[PDB]
Ligand binder design. Structure first.
Ligand SMILES: C[C@@H]1O[C@@H](O[C@@H]2[C@@H](O[C@H]3O[C@H](CO)[C@H](O)[C@H](O)[C@H]3O)[C@@H](O)[C@@H](CO)O[C@H]2O)[C@@H](O)[C@H](O)[C@@H]1O
Ligand SMILES: [Ca+2]
Length: 171
């Protein structure tokens, strides 16, 4: 097998919750700074509280949901890894900001991972990053990353940090 970063693949589609649709889901940057062509790396609060920066990943704004879809048909994907959280670059100006209800990993229409099971009340700016390390079913065709904003999209700078597939075949 080999490991391939999601950000080194093209998606089928990638939607977000930002009002400005000319902005786009970001490879290897958080959403807002990336769309501003800034060098700011993706960064997250880890399990111990420390801040880690990541070279690779995806940056979105949660939506209803915002969905990033990959065609993995024939690729022999056996594993998905990512950290999930709200990028440090977000601004938690009040309790309405940086509040994400859940993030799911969906394969061929089945939720195979959801933050709702550990985090029924969702993610906030100070929730520690969630380490997702997940088997992917044989012969899978579609994998989707879905982030749900809830009431508002404000400050919902969701990053899939270090997001990578392990795969036996090609894409
Ligand atoms: C000028 C306008 O600014 C941004 O929209 C804001 C919105 O911004 C926050 O939430 C978005 C996600 O919706 C991003 O995380 C931003 O980085 C945040 O600052 C809020 O502050 C609301 C409050 O009413 O106002 C909007 O104008 C940006 O998203 C838009 O694309 C646009 O650039
Ligand atoms: Ca929200």
């Amino acid at each position: 097998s080999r490991d391939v970063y999601l950000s080194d693949l093209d998606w089928l589609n990638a939607t977000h919750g930002d009002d400005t649709k000319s902005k786009i889901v970001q490879k290897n940057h958080p959403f807002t700074p990336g769309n501003n062509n800034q060098s700011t790396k993706i960064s997250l609060k880890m399990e111990d509280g420390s801040i880690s920066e990541f070279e690779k990943g995806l940056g979105t704004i949660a939506g209803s949901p915002s969905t990033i879809t990959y065609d993995i048909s024939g690729a022999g994907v056996t594993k998905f890894f990512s950290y999930l959280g709200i990028d440090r670059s977000a601004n938690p100006i009040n309790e309405q900001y940086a509040k994400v209800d859940k993030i799911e990993v969906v394969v061929d229409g089945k939720v195979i991972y959801s933050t709702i099971n550990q985090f029924p009340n969702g993610l906030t700016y100070e929730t520690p990053a969630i380490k997702v390390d997940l088997n992917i079913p044989e012969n899978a065709k579609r994998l989707q990353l879905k982030s749900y904003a809830g009431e508002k999209t404000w400050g919902d700078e969701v990053v899939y940090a270090d997001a990578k597939f392990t795969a036996k075949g090609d894409f």
